Amino acid sequence: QPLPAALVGSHVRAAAGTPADLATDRKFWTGLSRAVQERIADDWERTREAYGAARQQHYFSAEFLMGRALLNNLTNLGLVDEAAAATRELGHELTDILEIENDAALGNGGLGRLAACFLDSAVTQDYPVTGYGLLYRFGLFRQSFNEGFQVEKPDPWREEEYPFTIRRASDQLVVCFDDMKTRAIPYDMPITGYGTHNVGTLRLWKAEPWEEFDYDAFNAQRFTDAIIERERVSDICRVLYPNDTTYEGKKLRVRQQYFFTSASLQAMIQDHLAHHKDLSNFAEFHSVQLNDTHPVLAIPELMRLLMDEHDMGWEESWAIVSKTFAYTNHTVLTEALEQWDEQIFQQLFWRVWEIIAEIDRRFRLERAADGLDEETINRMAPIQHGTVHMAWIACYAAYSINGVAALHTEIIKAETLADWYALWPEKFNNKTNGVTPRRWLRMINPGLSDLLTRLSGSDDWVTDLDELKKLRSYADDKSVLEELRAIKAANKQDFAEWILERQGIEIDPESIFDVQIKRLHEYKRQLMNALYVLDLYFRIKEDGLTDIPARTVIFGAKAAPGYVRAKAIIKLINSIADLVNNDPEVSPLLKVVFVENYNVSPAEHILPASDVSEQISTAGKEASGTSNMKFMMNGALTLGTMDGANVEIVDSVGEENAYIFGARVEELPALRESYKPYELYETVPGLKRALDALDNGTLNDNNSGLFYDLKHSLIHGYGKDASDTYYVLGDFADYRETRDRMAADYASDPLGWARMAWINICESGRFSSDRTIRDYATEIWKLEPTPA
Amino acid sequence: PLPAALVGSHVRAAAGTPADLATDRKFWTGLSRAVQERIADDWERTREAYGAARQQHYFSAEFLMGRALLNNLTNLGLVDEAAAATRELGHELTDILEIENDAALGNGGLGRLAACFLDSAVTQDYPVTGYGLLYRFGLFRQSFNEGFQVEKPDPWREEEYPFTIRRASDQLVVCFDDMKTRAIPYDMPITGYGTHNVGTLRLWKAEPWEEFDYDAFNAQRFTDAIIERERVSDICRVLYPNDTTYEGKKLRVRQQYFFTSASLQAMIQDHLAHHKDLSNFAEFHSVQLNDTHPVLAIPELMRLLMDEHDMGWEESWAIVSKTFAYTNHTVLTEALEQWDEQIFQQLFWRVWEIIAEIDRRFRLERAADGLDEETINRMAPIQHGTVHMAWIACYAAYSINGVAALHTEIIKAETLADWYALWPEKFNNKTNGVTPRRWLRMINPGLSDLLTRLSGSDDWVTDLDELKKLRSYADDKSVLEELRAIKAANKQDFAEWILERQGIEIDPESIFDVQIKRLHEYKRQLMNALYVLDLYFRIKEDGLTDIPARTVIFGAKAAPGYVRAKAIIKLINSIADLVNNDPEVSPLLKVVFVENYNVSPAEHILPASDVSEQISTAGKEASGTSNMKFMMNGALTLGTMDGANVEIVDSVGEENAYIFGARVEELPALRESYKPYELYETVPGLKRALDALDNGTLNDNNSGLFYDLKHSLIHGYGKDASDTYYVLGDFADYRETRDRMAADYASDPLGWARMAWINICESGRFSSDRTIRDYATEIWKLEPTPAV
Ligand SMILES: *Cc1c(COP(=O)(O)O)cnc(C)c1O
Ligand SMILES: *Cc1c(COP(=O)(O)O)cnc(C)c1O
C-alpha cells in the first residue's frame, strides 16, 4: 500500500530510537522523508539507466533555489493524502512535520529559482537533464531584524540529517589547485515529477580537505594553525556569493567555480567512458548549458581533461568543446559581465591558465584571418588589459547563445554582444523564462487547482498549462467568478493566520493584498512603493481620505550586506510600518507587513493570497521577471512598468487586464536629460510632505542618519547627473495615479476585478517552464523524451 | 525475523537505489537502521524503567566502543537472519561488517573497561547510563612510513552513523567565561545478550553558539571568521589532546568541564521530572568517577544546586558527598591530575570560587579533626596555586575503590594513605573484568559452539563461571581435537585477514605469539624484540633447527612525543624486515606488526592467538584486561608475576601458564646492584643481539635511535642504571621460558590443548558481569530493573 503507517513508522523508529508516536517532529520528518526515498529508489535507478543510454544535457549553475523538498515530492508522487493519513495515525500532524524543513539554501534569487523550475519541467517531460552545482552549507545569509535594521547571519539547512541529498563518498574525485588539493564529494538530490515515474538528479558537490586537519600542528597545540587549511577548503562550500571586494575574496569566488565545474566534468567523463569506448564522441551524447558566466571555467577545464588525461589533440578537443557548450545571457548590460585578473588563474591553476592563454592566442589569429581589425579583436578577446573576460570565452566556445525574452534577446544582439552576433548570427536565439506550474500553482493553491480541474475535466493542466486557455470562456460565467473570489479570500484568510503565527501581526483578511517580493535594489524602487505608502498615510490622517478599500502592503526582500542604501530602504519600510500599524486613525485602512527572510517557502504562502503584484522597476532595467509570472498564475493583477515580463503579460491579457504606468524605456533619455527632481519635490502635491517626513522626526531611524541620506539621494542634483538615478520621483505621480485607480476598481467592481484575474490565470500557460524546457530541449540540446 | 524486506526498505532509503545495487557502505547503513528500528520499543521501555529507579551515571573521559553492528546483532540473536537477508539482497555480511570504523571514542584500558561495564550492566538489567564526549577524530590513526610511526586524525562518523542518535532539541548550554557553547546530546544504544533491556551511552557534542562570524566572513577575513567556531570544535576534536603547554592543558580541562556540566544538567532535568525537587537527588542517583578526568563534576554539581536551585552550601555538599564514588586505577601518584588554578579562574570563575571554598572549608574541617598543618597542606585540594583533582575526589566521594586486590591494598597503605587513615570506610576493591560477549561469544563462534554443545545451553554467555564445570573434559581427546581444529580455523581466518590488510603472507600452522599493548618501556616490547633478534641469529648462525615455526605478532601505538617508544616501534619494523626477508629464517620465524591496533584488530587477533605476551616489569601493572581476553580464547600466558597474571596463575596453576622473571619483592635488591653491562658481555648471544643495533645489521636511517636504545639498556649501575625496567636482567629467564613454551607446543600438541582448555574453563573469574554486580550491590546500591 502507498505509504502505509507501517512503512513510515519503520523509518521513523530507525531515526528516533523510540516508537514512532513518541518521536519528535524533527525525527518524524526524517522518517517520513526516508519513506519517500525508499519508494522512489527503484524509479530513480530506472531513470538513471534510461538517461545513461540517451543523449544528455548537463545544466551547470552556481545556484539552485530548491526550497523545501517534502511537500513537493509528496505532491508529484500523489501521496499527500496517504502521508496525511499515515502521519495522523502515528500521532502527528503533517502540517507541523512539513514546517520542520528549512528551504535548501542552495541558491540566491531568480537565476537559481529558474534552474530549479527547469529541473522540475525537465523530468515532468522525461528529458534526460541533470543539474550540477555546489552544495552550499550556509546559503547566502539568513535575514533577521534588530530594531528595524537588517542583520545577516549564517543560513544552515542540512546540519541535521537530510535524506533528500545522498552522499556518495566512494565516488569522490580530486580537484587539485596549485595551492590546495581537495576532495570532491558528490551528492545526489532526487527530482520528482508530477504525472511521471522519472526521477531526475541534481548533483551537488561538497569540498573536503585531503587531511581532516594538521595533526602535527594540533599536537603541538597550535590549535588555529591546525585547521587553517581545513577551513580554507571548507570555504569553497560555506556560503553562496561570498563578498569579493578584496583579492582573496575574488580568488575564493574563482575557486568555487573551478571546483564544481572540474568535479562535474570529471564525473561526466567517467560516466561516458562507462557507456562508450572513448571521448571522441562526447559531444554526440552530451551537451552542457552554462547558466550565466559562473560556470565558464568548464570550458578550459574540459580542454585540459581531454588533452592532458585522454591524450587528445587541441583541434579535436576544441571541436568537442565547441559542440558541447551552450551559453545563456541574463542581463541587457555589460556590467556584471564577469571579469577576472589573470593572476588569479595563474595562481590557482597554472595549467588551466596556459589553456585560457592558448584560447586567446588562437582566437586573435583566427579573427585576423576572418579579416577583423585590431580594435575589434582587442575588444572581443578573452584576455585584455591583464583581465580575463569570461563572457567572451563563452561566446567564442558556445554553439548557442540565448537571451531569456524577446526584447532582451534583441538587445544582446544589437548591443551587449553585438560583435559576436556580427561574426556568428546563427548562434543567437531566444528562450523565454518561465516557472513551474507544480510548485507555484498546484502545490500552493489547491483551492484554485480544484476549480481548474473541475472546469477542464482533469488535472492534465498541471503538466500542460496552455490547457487553461480553454477556460477563458468562463470569464463571463458569474458563478465561476464568484468561486474565484471565494478562493482568493480563503487563501487570504490562510495568509493572515500564517503571518500572525510567524511575526505576531494582525491584518485584515478582506483588505487588498498589495505585494512586492523582490530583492532590494534601488532600481527595483521598493523605495517608490514606500513613498506611496507614506503619502497615503498622510492623505488618510491629515487630508481626510476615506472613500477607499482597506489594504495591506506586503514586503519581502533581502538586501546585499554592503549595500548601504538598500539596507536603509529596508529600515525605512520597517519604520513606516511602525508609524502606520500603531496609528489607530490609519491602521483600519492601511497596514504594512515586512515578511522577514523572504525565500521560497515564504513565497509559497504569499502568492496564493496576493491581489496586486508590484513590478515597478525603472523601465529598461528588467530583462525578465519570473515572480511576475507566479503572481499571474495565482490570480493577482500586475501593477507595473512596461518592462521585462510585464510586456509579455500585457501582450497576453491586454492593456485592459493589467495596470501599466510610468515612462517607457525609449522616453527616459529625454526625461533624464532635463530631469528636475528637486522641482518635483517642491511641486507634486503631497511629495514635499512625504519626503520631509524622512528627516522631520515623523519616522525614526534610531539616530542612524539613514533616512536623511535617502531623502537627498532622491532630491539632490538635476539633469542626467541627478542623484535619483532610477527616476523614482519622476514616475511617482503616474505611479500613485495608477495605484489609486487600481484600488478603486477593486472596491467598486468586485466581479470586474475577478474577471481580469481569471483572464490572467487562463493566459498564464504562456509562462510555464515546460514550454521553455521543450524549446531548450528541441532547439539547443536536441533531446528526446526518455521514460524510465 | 529481521526479514530481507525490512532491510531492503532501509537500504533503499539510504542508497536512493534498489538494495541489491547499493554500495557496501549504504547497505551497512540500511542494515544498521533496520536494527535500530527493531530495538526502538525495548529502548524506550528501558528508558521508562530506569527513570523510575535508583540509577548509576558512569562518568568517563573515554569509552573504547569498537564496532557496533556485529555486537548488536549477536546480542539480539539476529546474526543468522542478518546474514541470510544480506545475501538474499546481493551482499555478504562480512563485507558489510568491515565497512564500520571502530568508534574512536576511547584510548585504551580505561576506556575499554568503561565499555565492558556498560555491556555487563545491561546484561544484568542494572540501571546504569554512561556519559562521555562524542570525540570526532579519536586519539590518532597510526600508519607507518619507512618503519616509523606516523600519526593522523582518526575519523569514524563522517558518514552517516545510525548507532548514535542526535537529540538537538534537548540541547543544553555550557558557558565558559570565554565561550558560550551548545551541548548537543547523542544517544548510543547498548544492547544486551539474553535480555530486552537496552542501555544508553550518552555522548556530548560541543557546537558553537553562532555557526561562524558572518561579519568577519563578509569582510573576507576568512580565518578570523571561523576561529571561535573551531575553538569550540576543539572540545570534541581529539581525545587526550597533547597538553605539554598551558593551552593544551586548558583544552583538556575545557573538555572535562564540558561533558560533566552537560551531563549533570541533564541528570537534574530528568530528576525534576520524577521528583518534586533535588533534596533527594542522592537517594536516586549515583555517579561513578572513572579516574580523575570527571572530577570537575563535583564543584559543578555544587554550582548547579546552589546557583540554579537555591540550595545552601551545607545541603549541597551533603548531596554531593553521597552522590559521587571515585575509582583509582594506578599505584602511582604522579599520574593524578593537577592543574594550575589560573586555568580555572579563566575558564569558569564561578566554578573556581566553589573549588576555592571547597579548599577553605576542607582545611578548617581537618583542623577541627585535629590533623597537623603539615598533613592538611599535603591533603588540601589547592596547594601552591595548583589544584589536586584526586584530593577533591577523595574528599567528596563516599567510595574509593581500587581495581585489583593488591592494587587496592597498596593505595590504602601508600598512594592514598592519608585518606585511608582519615576515612577507612570509603576504601574497597572491585577487580576489573571483560565482557564474555564481545570478547568470546561474538568473536569466537567456533569455540562458542563447542562450549554451548558441551554445556547444553548458552547460559555460559552471561554467566561465564558456568564453564568451570566443563573443566573435567580436559582429559577428553575428542574435545581437545575439536579445540585444536577451532584454533586452527581461527588462525587461518587471521592469516587471510592480515594478508588482505597488509599484504603479508603467514603460516597458519605456526605458533601465533602475540603482544598487543600500548608501547611503553615498562611494557617491554623491547625485550620481546631482543628475543626475536637473538632467535634470528640462533637460526641463522647457531644452526638452531629443533623448534616449531612461529609468527611473532605486535600491536602497539606510541604516544606522539615519546621518543624511546617510537624508536622501539622502528626497531621492531627493522627486525621484521631483517627476519621476514631472509630465506634461511623466514620459514621458521616471521614478525608481524599489526598497524593501527584497536578494538577491531584485537577481535581478529585474540581468537587466533596461541601465546599471550604479558611481560611487563613485575610491580608495574595493577590490572591486565587484555590478559583476560587471551585466557578466554585459549591462548597460554607468558608473563611476569604481576597484575592479572597473578590471578590467572592462581586459577589455572603454575603448570598451565608460563611465568618467569624477577618477582616484585626481589627487584629492590636486584636493582640496587644491577650491572646491565656485565649481562651485556656474559649472557650467551646477548652481546651479538645488542651489537646488531648499531653495527649496520639494522637500519636507523642514520637517526642514532637504535644506538640510544642500546645505550639505554647497557649503561649505568644500580639505582642509576639506564635499564630502568630490568630488560636485560629478565632476558635470560624470559628466553628460557619462551623457548620451553615453544618446545611444549610442538612436542605435546594435545597437552597444549589441555592447558588451553583449563584456561578457558577458569576464565569466568574475569567476567565484568561479576565486577558490575559488585559495583551495583556494594557501591551504587542498584537492583536489577527489567524493561519487559
Ligand atoms: C520566483 C522567485 C524569485 C525570482 O524573482 P524575481 O525578483 O522576479 O527575479 C526569487 N526568489 C524567490 C524566493 C522566488 O520564488
Ligand atoms: C582490551 C583492550 C585494551 C586494554 O588492555 P591493556 O592490557 O590494559 O593494554 C586496550 N585496547 C584494546 C584495543 C583492547 O581491546
TrEMBL record, chain A:
Gene Ontology molecular functions: glycogen phosphorylase activity; pyridoxal phosphate binding
Stated family: Belongs to the glycogen phosphorylase family.
PTM annotation (N6-(pyridoxal phosphate)lysine (covalent)): residues: K630
Name assigned to this protein: Alpha-1,4 glucan phosphorylase
NCBIfam families hit by this protein: P_ylase (TIGR02093)
Catalytic activity, reaction form: [(1->4)-alpha-D-glucosyl](n) + phosphate = [(1->4)-alpha-D-glucosyl](n-1) + alpha-D-glucose 1-phosphate
Keyword annotations: Allosteric enzyme, Carbohydrate metabolism, Glycosyltransferase, Pyridoxal phosphate, Transferase
Cofactor(s) needed by this chain: pyridoxal 5'-phosphate
One GO BP: glycogen catabolic process
Ligand binding (pyridoxal 5'-phosphate): K518, S627
Entries under InterPro entries matching the protein: Glycg_phsphrylas (IPR011833), Glyco_trans_35 (IPR000811), Pyridoxal_P_attach_site (IPR035090)
GO cellular component, one term: cytoplasm
One Pfam entry name: Phosphorylase
Physiological role: Phosphorylase is an important allosteric enzyme in carbohydrate metabolism. Enzymes from different sources differ in their regulatory mechanisms and in their natural substrates. However, all known phosphorylases share catalytic and structural properties.
Main enzyme class: transferase
Residues annotated with N6-(pyridoxal phosphate)lysine modification: K630
EC annotation from Swiss-Prot or TrEMBL: 2.4.1.1
UniProt xrefs under PROSITE patterns: PHOSPHORYLASE (PS00102)
